[PDB]
Each structure stands twice: as structure tokens, then as C-alpha cells.
């Protein structure tokens, strides 16, 4: 059983404590041995070698996250599908990086569309225009 | 035991599905390989039951796509990692619906942030400001 915590920037390091706490409360409630309480700083979309190692290890039968979005902002249903085939599963212990994730999405999508030069400045004016209504 | 997989966002792009099936069978015939071509209409992220069925089937050892982004706009490296553990892999035959995916993403992210009411109109002004 792997307990897994994620945060976008090393500014949100206190949310990693709120995650580890809720995750060990989860584990102790079912008096379960924990092999790995894994804390990662990385993109909800960019490389995450701690989660790569966890997903590539067939021994990590149960992967416990606080919310679904900590494992991935997109594609979790597909990861669950791939894991299911190997009798491994993702557990969600409870049913905010989103605005920062809106910028990293738009940056990458702007880079591909109009070139990397100023792609983040484009994404910044865009995240801004999507605030008025 | 090789799955050829083709994806398109809207059933308006059904011509880009022909370009994928063609390139995918050219790929398979070059290595004289038996094919067990899956064509899907769906989100580069939203539900895709054809890919779910493929990923949940352990017999699908090789999953062939035209470009990485046809399997998923995000998270492909993690899918590859999970599959690798079961000796299964994703093959990419070649190294845009992106703008339609930029709206799809910003809508959902706007709906979570400021409420679903007008969330697509917010995403639309945003996808527009990122064009100058």
C-alpha cells in the first residue's frame, strides 16, 4: 500500500502536511502497514519520477491519494483502467493548484500553436480574460 | 495481440480518422503483423470506453497510435509507466484539434473556479486573448 501526496510548487509545502496527515489517518483506521508515504512536488499534468517509480512497480497494489487530482488533473480513469488489468488500484480518501494548472496548460498549448517566445505571457493574459464574465 | 487505435475529438473531423487508419495499417503491414483498427470519437482528456476496454485488457500488449496526443493530450508518460509494469507498451507510428482541447480544458477549469454558469464563454475569451 503506497500513500501518495502531491503539490505543484514548493510554496504549497503545508498542503503536503494536510495530505500526509489525512493519508495516515486513512491507513491507521484500517490498521494497515505502510511501505511508502510518498511526497512529490510536480505538475498536475511535467515529469514526476516518484509516481513513475510507483506506477512501474507491480508490488504497489494499492495507491492511496487524498483527492483524484493529486495523482493527475487529467487521465486518472485511464491509469485505473491500465492498473485494473494487473489487479492494482487507486484509492481516493476524500471526494488549490488549478489556476496555476490553467497557466501551465495554456503556456504549453500556446507554445505548440504560436511558438515558445512569450507563450507564458499569452497564457497570463488569457487566464486574466477568463475572470470577468 | 497488437491494437491499432485512432481518435478524433468531434464527428466533424471523421476525415482525420481516415489518415490515422491508413498510416496505422501501413505501419502494421510493413512488419507483416496480424491486427486484432479501433476508431474512437472523444475528448483528448472526457470518457473514452473503447480506450478503457483496450487498457483494461491485459492481452493488448502493443497499443499503436499515430501521435502520442491521440492516446491522451496529458498523462501518456504515466500510462506507459503503469503498462510497463505488466510488460505492455504504447507504440508511436509518427512524431490540430489542440484549440478545441484548449476550450475543453479552460471550460472545466473555469467551472471549478467560478461556477459552471458561463464557464465556456470565459474559456472562449481566454482562447481568444492567447492569439495576439
From TrEMBL, chain A:
<dbReference type="GO" id="GO:0000150">
    <property type="term" value="F:DNA strand exchange activity"/>
</dbReference>
<protein>
    <submittedName>
        <fullName>IS607 family transposase IS1535</fullName>
    </submittedName>
</protein>
<feature type="domain" description="Resolvase/invertase-type recombinase catalytic">
    <location>
        <begin position="1"/>
        <end position="133"/>
    </location>
</feature>
<dbReference type="GO" id="GO:0003677">
    <property type="term" value="F:DNA binding"/>
</dbReference>
TrEMBL record, chain B:
<dbReference type="GO" id="GO:0000150">
    <property type="term" value="F:DNA strand exchange activity"/>
</dbReference>
<protein>
    <submittedName>
        <fullName>IS607 family transposase IS1535</fullName>
    </submittedName>
</protein>
<feature type="domain" description="Resolvase/invertase-type recombinase catalytic">
    <location>
        <begin position="1"/>
        <end position="132"/>
    </location>
</feature>
<dbReference type="GO" id="GO:0003677">
    <property type="term" value="F:DNA binding"/>
</dbReference>
